């Protein structure tokens, strides 16, 4: 199934995906800013290494990055706090309108339920990043060009982990699509916590466009 440039690619991604990791603090669960900040740091490092991303227009690059963030963070949260606590959250108490909490946890539980392998997480993240659909891209095709090979490899390794259920790959993109729709409420969710005199790091303002 998987060959031959599609092994060199998966390898190269797994390599990059794996050399950024969450240290220590997946232990003590304020700190939420550290986590958020870790997430982004790691995301950009993974992002920049991605085949072809060097070649992309700068303004596209930044767009691709800002748009991918909410999904990546749900994805990278999941790959950690479903394995490393083999619920319990700090976010009620962080003063987020309950309007947004109970919804956004549906999405979290949903993703864990897919029960993805770490090659699935890695490649899916990459697809999420290089979504040509994102706002303010100009060269949609140039992005689209880099995403094709990652897709058609992910496709295959869903038939491999595992064949039993043939709606797995479809069901993966589905949940992400389901989540894309939440992005405009996440904006508000954040702008809700920033009302009471609570501020973000400069980095977190840049990523979330604050």
């Amino acid at each position: 199934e998987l060959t031959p440039d599609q092994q060199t690619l998966l390898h190269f991604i797994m390599d990059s995906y794996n050399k950024q990791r969450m240290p220590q603090e997946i232990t003590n669960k304020l700190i939420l800013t550290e986590m958020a900040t870790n997430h982004v740091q790691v995301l950009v490092e993974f992002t920049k290494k991605l085949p072809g991303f060097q070649t992309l227009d700068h303004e596209d690059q930044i767009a691709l990055l800002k748009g991918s963030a909410v999904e990546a963070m749900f994805l990278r949260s999941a790959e950690i706090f479903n394995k490393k606590l083999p619920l319990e959250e700090r976010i009620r108490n962080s003063g987020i309108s309950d309007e947004y909490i109970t919804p956004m946890f549906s999405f979290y539980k949903s993703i864990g339920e897919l029960k993805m392998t770490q090659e699935e997480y890695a490649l899916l993240t990459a697809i999420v990043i290089l979504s040509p659909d994102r706002q303010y891209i100009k060269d949609r095709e140039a992005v689209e060009k880099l995403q094709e090979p990652l897709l058609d490899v992910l496709q295959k390794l869903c038939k491999i982990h595992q064949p039993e259920n043939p709606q797995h790959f479809a069901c993966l993109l589905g949940r992400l699509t389901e989540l894309r729709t939440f992005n405009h409420h996440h904006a508000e969710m954040l702008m809700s916590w920033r009302v009471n005199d609570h501020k973000f790091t400069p980095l977190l303002c840049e990523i979330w466009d604050v």
């Binding site: 740091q41 950009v44 490092e45 992002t47 920049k48 700068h58 690059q61 930044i62 990055l65 800002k66 400069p202 980095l203 840049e206 990523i207």
Partner: peptide, 12 residues
Amino acid sequence: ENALLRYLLDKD
């Protein structure tokens, strides 16, 4: 500004 992001991308 996206400038921190810019540094973080082109950084070696």
